Amino acid sequence: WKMAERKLFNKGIAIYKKDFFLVQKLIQTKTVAQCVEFYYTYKKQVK
Amino acid sequence: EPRINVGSRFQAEIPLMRDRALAAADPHKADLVWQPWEDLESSREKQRQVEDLLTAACSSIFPGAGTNQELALHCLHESRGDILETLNKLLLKKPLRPHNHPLATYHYTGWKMAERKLFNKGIAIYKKDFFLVQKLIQTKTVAQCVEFYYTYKKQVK
Amino acid sequence: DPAISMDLLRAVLQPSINEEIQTVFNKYMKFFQKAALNVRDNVGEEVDAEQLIQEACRSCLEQAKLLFS
Amino acid sequence: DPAISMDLLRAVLQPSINEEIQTVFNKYMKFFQKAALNVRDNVGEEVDAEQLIQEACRSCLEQAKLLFS
Amino acid sequence: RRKVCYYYDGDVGNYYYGQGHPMKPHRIRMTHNLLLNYGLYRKMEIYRPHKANAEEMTKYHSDDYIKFLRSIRPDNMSEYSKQMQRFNVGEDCPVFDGLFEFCQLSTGGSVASAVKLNKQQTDIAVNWAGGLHHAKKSEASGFCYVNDIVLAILELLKYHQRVLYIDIDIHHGDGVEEAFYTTDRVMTVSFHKYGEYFPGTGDLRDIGAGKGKYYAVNYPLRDGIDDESYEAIFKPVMSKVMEMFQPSAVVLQCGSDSLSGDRLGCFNLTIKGHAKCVEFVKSFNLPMLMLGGGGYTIRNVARCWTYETAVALDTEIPELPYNDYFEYFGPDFKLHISPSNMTNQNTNEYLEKIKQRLFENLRMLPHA
Ligand SMILES: O=P(O)(O)O[C@H]1[C@H](OP(=O)(O)O)[C@@H](OP(=O)(O)O)[C@H](OP(=O)(O)O)[C@@H](OP(=O)(O)O)[C@H]1OP(=O)(O)O
Ligand SMILES: [K+]
Ligand SMILES: [K+]
Ligand SMILES: [Zn+2]
């Protein structure tokens, strides 16, 4: 996971917040699994 | 290309060209909150002591808002040149009591997990209201609400 | 570690404390001084009287730590 | 041995000196006590405030040895 | 060395313009934190400024303009919409909570400093909150609502026969220019981009009028000016201005948006070149007042106004020390910036042309 895709992910999730199909098309390189995995790791880093 | 309307020109600076020390205020317009002091404080013996005084504070000393350096910064100023009068009025009854006449102190210094959760959802719904989220938490103000939004934005990285 | 506060308050107060300790030992330096000289009189030139005084006053500060043990 | 004669004198004077040092730190014990409690107030029960005070005052004596380097 | 008086109130960094708005007053708070951790705060006379009331704001502005500002809030926003159009409050000059209080601080910091220099109890004064230069007598403009610079200057004229105003800001200082357009006592010089740019003003031919003709210098520019170019055109001019105008007190506006990598600005200056100006004016040894103003890549505004303070103190500073906003400052955490590969469209001929035109204008003044 690169900082570039990280920024686009953060905005890509801050727009839809529950697509997981268009954000997949945002990053064709990565899959919904890794996309979903990073969403948790961030959710844990919130606390 | 704009116009210069005679009515909206300016208001006639109205000088005397001397007015030399004409009993002006600005003790009113501004309040003194530090004086240079290198006589006993920076005489190549104590100039390094304050450096140690201040890195000292950002540690297990008492909090006021919670960044324990700033309180010590605040308090050496509070003492005008002194060490124990600093250290006492630092630790003595409370930091608010000894200095209230400036009121910059309370300005500069100025969150529960419950409100934190509601904030996170309250911002994850609007994302740019800052008027309804203010009504979500009538206890807190838009300033603190906005302040916590930055501190989180920094904790992202 | 937050407990570093102690180490740094310490550094703040060390100059002031060191002034008072120096005042204390000044009362007792004459005993140390002649004692070292008496050694260098009864042993030869290879005795450093000043080193003996310094070592003794350091040892004193070591033993004082029992006040706070 | 030279160092023995000196430490032997050192033992004689240690009680008198330890008294005066205890008098000194009694002036400063409150500052240690507030700070150590404050650490425990913020961190929790597992902090031994008394142990912190003792360690600090021992450390002051270690640093005082630089008076006699 | 010169005595410095610094002014600051902490609520300034907390007032908020609105979403996406390039003006962010929080930048001034960052500066205040860096001056500190640099150890400079220690060295100068610090002050809080008290609130400036409508009493002294109206000494330049309209009595009802200020009355409108004192009355307006977002609560009564739709009620006042008729006047809002009359007073330019809108698209890029939003309404926001605490707007008037923000003005009282920015103005109070300047006017307090104006008196301190008048009182002859300082050599330099600084108010980074101030420096808002687009405001008009009866309307807001360009994020400016109250022109503290004028209100500052109006105090100094009581004491000072000739006050020099200068403007580094990439935006033209039309507000101060307009507010002294027909007075010889106040010279307004302005270096700025020109052509497809706000406020569209300050061309070569904007000279002044009436008594104030040949007392409103201007110097339009194109994209991508370097520090070397800017220095080679700044010092010769200001030397002649000091040679001709002969002021007894200076007001430098330290517009930071003329830096490289600005959000809105499209110049290619560094901290060093931007500050070298502040050195050069300081060299002339007049009663001084440095203000802020524009600047929208706030990480560099902090770097800029911090360093420039050190120049007023003529001390050295390295490596950015630790502070609250240390994490703002990129991966580098360095004070100085470098210029971009951006192109300098300011050819030597275009610069030398306008130079000679100005020299002619400056030779018109009295001398011996
Ligand atoms: O994500 P970052 O790299 O930290 O940058 C953001 C971002 O600016 P950019 O979009 O130009 O990167 C925000 O813009 P939006 O996400 O709102 O479009 C901006 O908010 P404003 O444009 O509303 O100022 C915000 O600034 P701030 O933190 O002052 O709200 C700023 O963060 P930084 O200021 O930390 O760069
Ligand atoms: K300008
Ligand atoms: K003029
Ligand atoms: Zn500007």
Author numbering:
A (entry chain L): 833 to 879
B (entry chain F): 720 to 829, 833 to 879
C (entry chain A), D (entry chain B): 62 to 130
E (entry chain E): 8 to 325, 327 to 376
Paper text:
Class I histone deacetylases (HDACs 1–3) are essential regulators of gene expression. The enzymes are recruited to chromatin as part of large multi-protein complexes that control the acetylation state of histones and other chromatin-associated factors. In the MiDAC complex, the large ELM2-SANT protein MIDEAS (1045 aa), recruits HDAC1 or 2. In conclusion, our structural and functional studies of the MiDAC complex reveal a striking molecular machine whose architecture appears to have evolved to facilitate processive chromatin deacetylation.
For the tetramer, 63,222 particles were included in the final 4.5-Å map with D2 symmetry applied. The tetrameric complex clearly contains a dimer of the dimeric complexes with no obvious structural perturbations. The arrangement is such that the DNTTIP1 dimerisation domains are symmetrically juxtaposed, but do not directly interact. The two S-shaped dimers are rotated 180° with respect to each other with the four HDAC subunits positioned at the periphery of the tetramer, which results in a striking three-dimensional X-shaped complex. This three-dimensional X-shape of the tetrameric complex positions the active sites of the four HDACs at the extremities of the complex. The tetramerisation interface between the two dimers is mediated by interactions between the SANT domains. Residues Lys849, Tyr874 and Val878 contribute to the interface between the two neighbouring SANT domains. Interestingly, Lys839 and Lys843 appear to be in a position to interact with the inositol phosphate that is bound to the neighbouring dimer, although there is no apparent density for the side chains. This may explain why it was only possible to obtain a high-resolution map of the tetramer in the presence of inositol phosphate (7.7 Å vs 4.5 Å). Given the overall size of the MiDAC complex and the outward-facing HDAC active sites at the complex extremities, it is likely that MiDAC is able to simultaneously target multiple nucleosomes.
